[PDB]
């Protein structure tokens, strides 16, 4: 939306966004965590080439 | 028998002029909207 008169238009050319949060499990006394995208970061990807 | 030997003899070689815009700009009369024209030969 408009902000202080500045009209910020929608961003185009982002076909798909996927939010890969991590995955974690406590197997016995050791916890194994697949770290996801860190909060406050992100990556642009050229797909499947 | 290179071409450079015959390069000086321009009369033999084909002449093609590099066509280009030449001349001078036409001068327009700008004052007339400002001025009221009165014409009398006996001024």
């Amino acid at each position: 939306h408009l902000l202080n008169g500045s009209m910020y238009p929608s961003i185009k050319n982002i076909s798909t966004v996927i939010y890969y949060d991590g995955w974690e499990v406590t197997v016995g006394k050791k916890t194994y965590s697949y770290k996801g995208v860190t909060p406050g970061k992100g990556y642009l990807i050229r797909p499947k080439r | 028998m290179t071409f450079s030997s015959t390069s000086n003899l321009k009369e033999l070689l084909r002449k093609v002029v590099l066509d280009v815009e030449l001349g001078r700009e036409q001068v327009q009369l700008l004052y007339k909207p400002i001025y009221d024209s009165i014409a009398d030969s006996n001024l």
Partner: protein, 125 residues
Amino acid sequence: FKGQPTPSTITQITRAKISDGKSVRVILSEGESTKTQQFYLINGFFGVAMQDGEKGDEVTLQIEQAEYETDNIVTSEAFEAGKLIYWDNTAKKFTTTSASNRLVGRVTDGKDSNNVIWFILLPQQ
């Protein structure tokens, strides 16, 4: 290829010979100039200047080691067929004097009435 999707490596396949080498390009100094189809010793290369060079322009010298008809000899000297023929750079004239001059060829047809000679151009030693 810029921005290509994967890294890649390029391997150079070497080769030495680049040109037949019958002629070379030279750049003319301040005092040097050339008329087409005349012999000049420019930048250590002696050959038939193929184009009008004047100064600063690049002029081809043609060094095929063929037979050439030149005259432009020091007329005081007799050019017998077979004599070694040298280039006097100070006088810009052919000569059989040798001394400190550069060796450029060997005469095939001797000095005729018009001071015309035919000679085989020697390599650029």
